[PDB]
Amino acid sequence: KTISFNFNQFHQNEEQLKLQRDARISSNSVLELTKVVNGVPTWNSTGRALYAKPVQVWDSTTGNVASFETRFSFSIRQPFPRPHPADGLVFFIAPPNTQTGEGGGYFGIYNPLSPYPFVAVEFDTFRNTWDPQIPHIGIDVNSVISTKTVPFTLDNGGIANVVIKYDASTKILHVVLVFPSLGTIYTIADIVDLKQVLPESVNVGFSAATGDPSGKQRNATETHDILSWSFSASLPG
Amino acid sequence: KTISFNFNQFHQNEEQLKLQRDARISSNSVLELTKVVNGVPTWNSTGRALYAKPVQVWDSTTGNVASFETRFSFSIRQPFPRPHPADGLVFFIAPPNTQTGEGGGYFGIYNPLSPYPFVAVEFDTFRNTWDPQIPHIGIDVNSVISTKTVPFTLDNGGIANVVIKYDASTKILHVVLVFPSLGTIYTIADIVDLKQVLPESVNVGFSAATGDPSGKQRNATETHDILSWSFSASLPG
Numbered sequence: 001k002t003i004s005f006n007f008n009q010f011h012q013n014e015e016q017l018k019l020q021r022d023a024r025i026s027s028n029s030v031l032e033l034t035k036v037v038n039g040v041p042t043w044n045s046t047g048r049a050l051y052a053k054p055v056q057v058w059d060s061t062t063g064n065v066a067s068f069e070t071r072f073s074f075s076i077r078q079p080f081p082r083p084h085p086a087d088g089l090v091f092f093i094a095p096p097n098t099q100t101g102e103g104g105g106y107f108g109i110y111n112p113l114s115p116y117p118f119v120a121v122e123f124d125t126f127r128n129t130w131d132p133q134i135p136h137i138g139i140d141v142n143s144v145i146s147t148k149t150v151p152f153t154l155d156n157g158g159i160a161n162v163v164i165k166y167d168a169s170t171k172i173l174h175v176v177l178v179f180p181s182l183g184t185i186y187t188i189a190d191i192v193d194l195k196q197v198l199p200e201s202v203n204v205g206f207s208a209a210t211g212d213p214s215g216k217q218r219n220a221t222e223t224h225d226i227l228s229w230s231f232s233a234s235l236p237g
Numbered sequence: 238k239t240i241s242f243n244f245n246q247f248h249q250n251e252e253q254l255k256l257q258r259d260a261r262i263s264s265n266s267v268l269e270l271t272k273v274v275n276g277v278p279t280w281n282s283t284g285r286a287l288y289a290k291p292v293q294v295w296d297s298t299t300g301n302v303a304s305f306e307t308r309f310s311f312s313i314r315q316p317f318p319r320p321h322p323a324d325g326l327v328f329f330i331a332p333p334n335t336q337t338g339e340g341g342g343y344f345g346i347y348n349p350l351s352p353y354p355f356v357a358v359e360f361d362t363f364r365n366t367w368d369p370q371i372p373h374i375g376i377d378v379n380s381v382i383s384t385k386t387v388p389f390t391l392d393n394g395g396i397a398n399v400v401i402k403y404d405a406s407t408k409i410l411h412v413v414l415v416f417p418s419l420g421t422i423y424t425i426a427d428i429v430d431l432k433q434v435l436p437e438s439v440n441v442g443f444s445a446a447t448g449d450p451s452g453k454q455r456n457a458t459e460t461h462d463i464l465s466w467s468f469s470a471s472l473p474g
């Protein structure tokens with residue numbers, strides 16, 4: 001069939017969402033993935049938002065795979081330039097009913113203990129041992145070690161428009177990152193076989209994380225706000 | 238092996254540009270692919286601009302194929318809404334030393350009498366018998382009958398930002414079309430093996446065309462201006 005939803009803004013206690021950990025909805029409508037107290041982002045924070053109902057990316061009966069397009073706007077404000085903001089946010093697809101994973105450079109989607117598959121598009125702002133310079137957009141498959149990455153300069157506190165598109169017939173997952181205020185455009189694409197790494201039904205959502213305590217740096221933090229979000233998927237048959 | 242060039246604007250008879258047919262450079266720096274007399278675009282016009290030097294997309298010795306990224310800004314002003322603007326502009330890669338081809342729906346890159354391979358990204362503004370709804374972005378390979386197309390709404394006379402990127406390792410050619418004034422974003426991608434369709438050395442450039450006389454409609458016209466252009470290619474070879 002063909003599912004599709006769309007939030008032009010968020011309402012406190014959104015029946016259509018599942019907030020986890022530090023994820024909250026501010027009074028003025030934005031989805032704050034990581035904690036921010038009195039206008040200031042704190043470290044040691046991790047949160048995710050999933051769409052309440054599961055979506056079917058493929059049908060084992062027909063063998064068909066769904067194509068999808070999702071658009072969202074986010075904003076990352078980095079109050080403390082030194083020594084290094086962290087960690088970033090990601091959009092991900094995962095099995096339904098998963099639980100927040102490790103924080104820090106794992107964005108809360110990777111769980112070393114009990115690893116579950118996931119396809120995610122990351123917006124990394126802190127350089128871990130496995131990362132190339134930052135910030136960078138990355139395409140992750142079952143691992144936080146991106147298959148493809150591309151650098152980008154962040155518009156601190158500005159608005160970012162993202163477009164993620166998946167064409168099943170070509171298996172191409174292409175993402176676009178635009179900062180309207182700077183007129184800058186960033187693009188990245190890679191081949192991904194959803195049918196090969198994910199179950200027929202999945203959850204889609206966001207996950208973010210601020211500096212991990214082990215880094216011993218309270219400054220290692222930033223905001224991870226989601227302003228709007230629309231999703232559309234087509235599974236012929 | 239990295240080649241690259243940037244034009245933040247164009248100047249009267251530039252050293253590194255080969256203008257063909259109606260293509261000219263206005264006194265105020267824009268590259269006008271098709272004819273415009275006294276601020277008005279005319280029909281029966283065709284013009285191309287090629288980068289003076291040839292670029293190497295692949296080496297037959299190593300078998301390696303180059304990856305590349307090119308960005309440009311164009312503007313299409315359609316003064317006459319009825320009966321229909323035509324025909325559009327394209328960015329293309331082709332064997333070196335080619336001559337302008339047929340105009341009209343062929344954008345000046347296809348020559349029925351002496352065909353030559355070419356890879357192109359088109360912004361089609363007229364609907365020929367082989368065309369789907371217009372306007373649309375299309376990826377063409379040796380034919381003006383796109384392998385993949387996506388519709389888009391034009392910002393009449395507005396500025397358009399384009400980003401074309403080719404990743405050799407995945408063979409993915411992804412293009413992004415942004416209209417900053419409307420904040421709209423369009424994206425399309427397909428698999429293309431340059432090594433399979435083009436020679437080692439090629440020319441890169443633009444080509445446009447206005448209504449063909451056979452259409453018997455002088456209003457079938459519009460402008461095809463290129464404001465800026467940057468190109469970068471990397472051959473590991």
Ligand SMILES: *[C@@H]1O[C@H](CO)[C@@H](O[C@@H]2O[C@H](CO)[C@@H](O)[C@H](O)[C@H]2NC(C)=O)[C@H](O[C@@H]2O[C@@H](C)[C@@H](O)[C@@H](O)[C@@H]2O)[C@H]1NC(C)=O
Nearest residue numbers: 040078079080081082083084085215216217218219220221
């Ligand atoms: C953590 O972020 C703090 C807020 O930006 C930094 O402190 C600020 O540092 C400025 C110069 O870097 C200085 O002008 C400000 O007065 C100060 N703001 C306040 C009132 O705290 C801090 O920078 C360093 O550490 C602080 C404690 C001071 O020693 C500064 O002189 C240092 O530059 C950031 N900590 C770091 C860099 O690890």
Ligand SMILES: *[C@@H]1O[C@H](CO)[C@@H](O[C@@H]2O[C@H](CO)[C@@H](O)[C@H](O)[C@H]2NC(C)=O)[C@H](O[C@@H]2O[C@@H](C)[C@@H](O)[C@@H](O)[C@@H]2O)[C@H]1NC(C)=O
Nearest residue numbers: 258259272279280281282283284340448449450451452453
């Ligand atoms: C469409 O444009 C062509 C050139 O861009 C015209 O052909 C050229 O016309 C010139 C003026 O008539 C002539 O000096 C050139 O030799 C000739 N060269 C070419 C490319 O064929 C073409 O047709 C001409 O113009 C029309 C108006 C008639 O006068 C014909 O006899 C000419 O061939 C133009 N077609 C039309 C219908 O405008």
Ligand SMILES: *[C@@H]1O[C@H](CO)[C@@H](O[C@@H]2O[C@H](CO)[C@@H](O)[C@H](O)[C@H]2NC(C)=O)[C@H](O[C@@H]2O[C@@H](C)[C@@H](O)[C@@H](O)[C@@H]2O)[C@H]1NC(C)=O
Nearest residue numbers: 277315316317318319320321322452453454455456457458
């Ligand atoms: C060819 O383009 C012309 C310029 O836009 C069209 O004329 C304009 O038509 C408008 C309504 O279509 C009218 O409000 C404008 O005043 C007029 N502008 C001028 C000075 O021509 C033209 O439209 C046709 O021809 C005109 C003279 C009228 O009879 C209209 O009813 C016709 O549609 C366009 N011709 C076409 C569509 O083939």
Ligand SMILES: *[C@@H]1O[C@H](CO)[C@@H](O[C@H]2O[C@H](CO)[C@@H](O)[C@H](O)[C@H]2NC(C)=O)[C@H](O[C@@H]2O[C@@H](C)[C@@H](O)[C@@H](O)[C@@H]2O)[C@H]1NC(C)=O
Nearest residue numbers: 021022042043044045046103211212213214215216217218
């Ligand atoms: C990072 O954030 C944690 C919140 O999830 C803090 O611990 C809290 O959660 C633990 C379970 O992991 C609970 O047992 C505690 O009640 C919570 N502690 C607090 C903040 O009230 C965590 O705090 C540190 O670690 C916990 C286990 C306690 O020892 C705290 O005193 C200690 O500060 C926090 N880490 C840091 C470095 O702040």
Ligand SMILES: OC[C@H]1O[C@H](O[C@H]2[C@@H](O)[C@@H](CO)O[C@@H](O[C@H]3[C@H](O)[C@@H](O)[C@@H](O)O[C@@H]3CO)[C@@H]2O)[C@H](O)[C@@H](O)[C@H]1O
Nearest residue numbers: 086087104105106126128210211212214215216217220
């Ligand atoms: O600043 C926040 C970041 O914290 C972690 O990043 C690593 C670095 O901060 C690194 C510094 O050398 O330290 C790592 O952990 C330490 C242990 O704490 C220490 O006991 C010893 O084992 O060495 C290691 C490695 O040096 C931190 O993991 C997060 O992983 C990162 O995402 C940021 O949030």
Ligand SMILES: OC[C@H]1O[C@H](O[C@H]2[C@@H](O)[C@@H](CO)O[C@@H](O[C@H]3[C@H](O)[C@@H](O)[C@@H](O)O[C@@H]3CO)[C@@H]2O)[C@H](O)[C@@H](O)[C@H]1O
Nearest residue numbers: 323324341342343363365447448449451452453454457
């Ligand atoms: O008006 C601009 C467009 O002109 C051509 O488009 C074709 C169509 O307009 C088509 C009508 O359906 O007519 C074609 O030409 C006619 C000949 O004039 C006629 O003698 C006979 O051969 O039939 C054909 C139609 O097949 C036009 O070519 C351009 O092709 C298009 O790109 C626009 O520029």
Ligand SMILES: [Ca+2]
Nearest residue numbers: 105126127128
């Ligand atoms: Ca990281």
Ligand SMILES: [Ca+2]
Nearest residue numbers: 342361363365
């Ligand atoms: Ca056409």
Ligand SMILES: [Mn+2]
Nearest residue numbers: 124131138146
């Ligand atoms: Mn990364």
Ligand SMILES: [Mn+2]
Nearest residue numbers: 361368375383
């Ligand atoms: Mn077309």
